[PDB]
Design a protein around this ligand. Structure first.
Ligand SMILES: Nc1ncnc2c1ncn2[C@@H]1O[C@H](COP(=O)(O)OP(=O)(O)OP(=O)(O)O)[C@@H](O)[C@H]1O
Ligand SMILES: Nc1ncnc2c1ncn2[C@@H]1O[C@H](COP(=O)(O)OP(=O)(O)O)[C@@H](O)[C@H]1O
Ligand SMILES: [Mg+2]
Ligand SMILES: [Mg+2]
Lengths: 244, 49, 243, 49
């Protein structure tokens, strides 16, 4: 703000409150912890190590002289509840949570996709620490071998902008991505590698026990069975996912 | 809080008759007075003054 | 390529040595092209201009090109200057085509760049450090020397090369006296510097669990197994019919 | 150029278009000069004609 008639700096800073990325921060704070989702029990512990634990006690990492993890990269079957696992940690840590659908990026206006992801990353540093959930990496992961003449360079530009923000030259900002894909065959060698995504995690299909876990949560929202036997239920749902 | 306003603009051309046209960031083109702080010898058209 | 021009200019004078006008780095990712650029930035202390190749080309026509000129004219005032261009993958199109927005307008910002680094309008003293993943999606003008006179290949670090990377990360950590880095670099053959950071962090996760400050030999081999397993699978299959 | 205080033409101006770095930039000076006709020599002969 400038006091007019001399038009010189008098007041820092009213800047800027930009709804375009400001408005995609917190999701009214998650009501999901990792006690309102299961089935991916084994995976959950791994994730708590990579994200929550630095925040819980930093000193355990300082103590072993190690860099703390950069978060987790999840692939698996669609719908297993990768979103809900990001939500579970974000809530529990009591840190800033930025949920972006990451496929809604990539504009057909050139490099606008890249611009936008530059803002979301910057936004993260200002409100650091912040955990960012980048959903869907099937429309922002580029292909280096041509298949769409106008397409390849465009998705690539966007992609290498966010990589640049991630640890290209610039600090992490204690992000801690937390970003879900389902294909590891559509990623580029550039992002695939760790130091951008330290612990690459396989998310498989739920075990026998895991069907059962998910089931008990959902039937407690219902009126529940009066002839309980969850062993039967598990068998049928074998070969499916958490969303099913 | 009162630091005077000094307009910033970029030189359009340098005149042979010992003057200079300079474009304000307001918009309107102006012919300015030379001075001995900054001469027409440190300046060229496009110089930010 | 940049130390000697600033600190040893009498050499240039006496012998008669044309100055170098850039260094091109290419090679697989995570190897520490970015670490080398910072190090040079820190340790020759002269004007370190950091720009990014995805940052060029915006939504208006010819904005990206505008932006390139601004950078070159400022570099010319600030010389000695090193422009460090991070990413060359999306900014360059080896192939040419017309009337495509990812393959004609990315070429009108390429053409402004080729073209101020050296060209009709000089330079300054840049010394432009370019770095990319692949040259196979990089325009040949950059590839050819003349400007970007030292064509620096970067491979995945050597057998001995990988033992040194381990030892930098360990220099910051701790170790046990059963630890042998050579055995671990073997396993991790054909791996970049970034991968090694993940081994040392992951090994650190085992040490933590077991409540110890030092990392032992067992923890590292456990981390090579851990990280790798979760990235590609092992089960399947035996006959039936393949027996 | 008009008188600023109240308007009236006071100066013709030798009349400009906004040369900046266009016609203003005349450079052909060393290293590259006419002492350095490196080539590709036949190509330069065509240009000379
Ligand atoms: N040789 C190395 N030794 C130790 N750590 C390394 C090494 N190389 C990279 N890293 C770590 O991985 C991080 C990310 O990689 P960095 O940004 O340096 O890669 P780059 O080679 O410039 O890659 P790209 O092809 O993606 O442009 C580094 O900042 C560093 O912490
Ligand atoms: N493990 C789970 N527990 C509870 N609800 C689940 C689970 N997995 C997915 N769902 C539900 O299925 C739907 C789609 O899955 P969602 O969590 O959005 O995942 P993704 O981002 O992995 O596609 C949502 O309505 C979600 O509540
Ligand atoms: Mg979802
Ligand atoms: Mg790099």
């Amino acid at each position: 703000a400038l006091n007019q008639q001399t038009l010189a700096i008098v007041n820092v800073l009213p800047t800027s409150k930009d709804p375009m990325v400001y408005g995609f921060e917190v999701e009214e704070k998650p009501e999901v912890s990792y006690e309102d989702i299961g089935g991916l029990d084994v995976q959950i512990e791994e994730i708590r190590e990579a994200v929550e634990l630095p925040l819980l006690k930093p000193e355990l990492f300082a103590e072993v002289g190690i860099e703390p993890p950069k978060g987790v990269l999840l692939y698996g079957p669609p719908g297993t509840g990768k979103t809900l696992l990001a939500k579970a940690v974000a809530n529990q840590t009591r840190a800033t949570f930025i949920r972006v659908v990451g496929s809604e990026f990539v504009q057909k206006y050139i490099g606008e996709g890249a611009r936008l992801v530059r803002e979301v990353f910057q936004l993260a540093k200002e409100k650091a620490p912040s955990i960012i959930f980048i959903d869907e990496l099937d429309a922002i992961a580029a292909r280096r071998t041509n298949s769409d003449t106008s397409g390849d360079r465009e998705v690539q530009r966007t992609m290498m902008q966010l990589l640049a923000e991630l640890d290209g030259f610039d600090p992490r900002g204690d992000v801690k991505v937390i970003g879900a894909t389902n294909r590891i065959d559509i990623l580029d060698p550039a992002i695939l590698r760790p130091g951008r995504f330290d612990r690459i995690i396989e998310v498989p299909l739920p075990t026998f026990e895991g069907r059962i876990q998910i089931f008990k949560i959902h039937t407690r929202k219902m009126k529940l069975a009066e002839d309980v036997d969850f062993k039967e239920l598990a068998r049928i749902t074998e070969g499916a996912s958490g969303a099913d | 809080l009162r630091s005077p306003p000094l307009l910033v603009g970029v030189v359009s051309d340098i005149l042979e008759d010992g003057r200079v046209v300079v474009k304000s960031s307001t918009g309107p083109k102006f012919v300015v007075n030379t001075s001995q702080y900054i001469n027409e010898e440190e300046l060229k058209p496009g110089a930010r003054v | 390529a940049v130390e000697l021009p600033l600190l040893k200019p009498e050499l240039f004078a006496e012998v008669g040595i044309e100055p170098p006008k850039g260094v091109l780095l290419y090679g697989p990712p995570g190897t520490g092209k970015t670490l080398l650029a910072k190090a040079v930035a820190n340790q020759t202390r002269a004007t370190f201009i950091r720009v990014v190749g995805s940052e060029f080309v915006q939504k208006y026509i010819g904005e990206g090109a505008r932006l390139v000129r601004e950078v070159f004219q400022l570099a010319k005032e600030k010389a000695p200057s090193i422009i460090f261009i991070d990413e060359l993958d999306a900014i360059a199109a080896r192939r040419t085509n017309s009337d495509t927005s990812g393959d004609r307008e990315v070429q009108r910002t390429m053409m402004q760049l080729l073209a101020e680094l050296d060209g009709f309008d000089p330079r300054g003293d840049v010394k432009v450090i370019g770095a990319t993943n692949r040259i196979d999606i990089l325009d040949p003008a950059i590839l050819r020397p003349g400007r970007f006179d030292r064509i620096i290949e970067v491979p995945l670090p050597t057998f001995e090369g990988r033992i040194q990377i381990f030892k930098i990360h360990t220099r910051k950590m701790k170790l046990a006296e059963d630890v042998d880095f050579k055995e671990l670099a073997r396993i991790t053959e054909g791996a970049s510097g970034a991968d090694i950071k993940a081994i040392c962090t992951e090994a650190g996760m085992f040490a933590i669990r077991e409540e110890r400050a030092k990392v032992t030999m067992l923890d590292f081999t456990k981390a090579i197994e851990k990280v790798l397993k979760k990235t590609t699978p092992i089960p399947d299959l035996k006959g039936v019919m393949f027996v």
